[PDB]
Amino acid sequence: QIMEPHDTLSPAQVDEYRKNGFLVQEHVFDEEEIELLRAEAAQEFASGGERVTVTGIVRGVHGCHLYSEVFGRLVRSPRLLPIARQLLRDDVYVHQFKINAKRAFVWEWHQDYTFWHHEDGMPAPRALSAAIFLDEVTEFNGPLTFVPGGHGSGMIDADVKGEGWANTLTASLKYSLDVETMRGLIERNGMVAPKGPRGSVLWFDANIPHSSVPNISPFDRGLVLITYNSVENKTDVTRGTRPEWLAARDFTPLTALQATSF
Amino acid sequence: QIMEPHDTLSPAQVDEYRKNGFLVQEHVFDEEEIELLRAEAAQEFASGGERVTVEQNTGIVRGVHGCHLYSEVFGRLVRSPRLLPIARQLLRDDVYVHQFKINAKRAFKGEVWEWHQDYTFWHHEDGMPAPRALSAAIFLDEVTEFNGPLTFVPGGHGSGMIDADVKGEGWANTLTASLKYSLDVETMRGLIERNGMVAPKGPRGSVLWFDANIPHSSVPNISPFDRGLVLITYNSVENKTDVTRGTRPEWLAARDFTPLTALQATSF
Ligand SMILES: O=C(O)CCC(=O)C(=O)O
Ligand code: PRO
Ligand code: PRO
Ligand SMILES: [O]
Hints:
Two copies of one chain form a homodimer. By secondary structure, chain A is an alpha+beta fold.
């Protein structure tokens, strides 16, 4: 049995990711694969307990690669792992895994690294996220939106609206970026909401500012977001404040799935 | 503590490797790193017992095999961030060590390596099912025209297995001056008349990457200079050898196919 030999990004793709802070690869996973991932997402939303977040409809579920065999395999996929290694220039592990159901009918502006630095003791922004598109992403179903090049600043200041971690994944975020700071970033660099078909992968930098608007449209915008971190960049578990299913503590380097008879 | 971020080959470098079947990177390891490896090699030649091979005319050391299984230093080298990411890159897979050897090719007494493709050996002796493997040869000494450099047929890997005459049952003569698989003389001449021969040179600490199927040879060293090479053969995990058709011990042909991970920088 055989897996396709590992594909990595071209030098122009790597340049684009480094310059913009994001990159889309279209049609990484096929329809049948996506539908497997959608079924498992639905299982996780149904049975995830305290790892589910909520009007009261599912907003997200966290940590599923620790609890689902299917998602545990996904993060080792040869479509994903080799690019994560290549971009981070290290062995890698999963810092965070989440499925953000942007149901058919806000995430405020933020840099992920800001969260992971302060909540989890991530020492440098040497991490990224791969967002797998379970639905077509269009202009109308609340696409992730970025300030391109906005990661080159580094961490940007934000008020800490909370003395807990409950508000880290609510509509009102613990470390939101203010209107004055964003207006500046946006006037300088612009805003971009990358689009793509079901099965695409959107890669984005831990430090890139991003947001998404409410989805009142008729279509869902399900994303599976896998955050890969450099093993060298492992979080300081002594500054960590969160459960495992938000901030991993097993730093074992990931290895790629091989083709087996089962 | 910080390891330098993993460096991979450029697209030009990869293209050169695929087209020629070999590639030199100069100055990968520094003198002090090489000296550590030289000292460990000397330990392995002194204590490897049955894993050590000697030259026939004289009894001086020819080779030692499997050291990554027995030396911690050599166990870490194979995981080095200077080596592992390139092997992963070139084999487009996770990888493991099929074979590890140190070929000492001393100053005046070092003997021939006749023309051979490594893959021919690994396929028939060890059950490697495709040539999706490569060797990284670390230069413990400057390799020059005169100290018996590995010599290749550039592009000679792109015909698969070439036809060889087999000498005997068993495997002792896989490591000798006269090899169990010797190449057909007219096919050799034809290969060479169309592709030429090249002996890559380079300073101490270089790495010479070469394809599992590239024809290669080396002459005796009559310089007053050693040519110690540490040869690490990485194989694709997908391409793991079929251990049911395997005829040799573990220190010639690995059985543990666990994918390798890179060394990190720790406080010890
Ligand atoms: O449409 C979505 O929100 C993606 C699919 C999903 O999250 C689910 O199957 O429950
Ligand atoms: O708390 C966290 O880590 C995730 C990622 C940024 C917003 N919510
Ligand atoms: O027997 C082997 O495996 C090595 C490679 C060719 C010569 N000796
Ligand atoms: O080799």
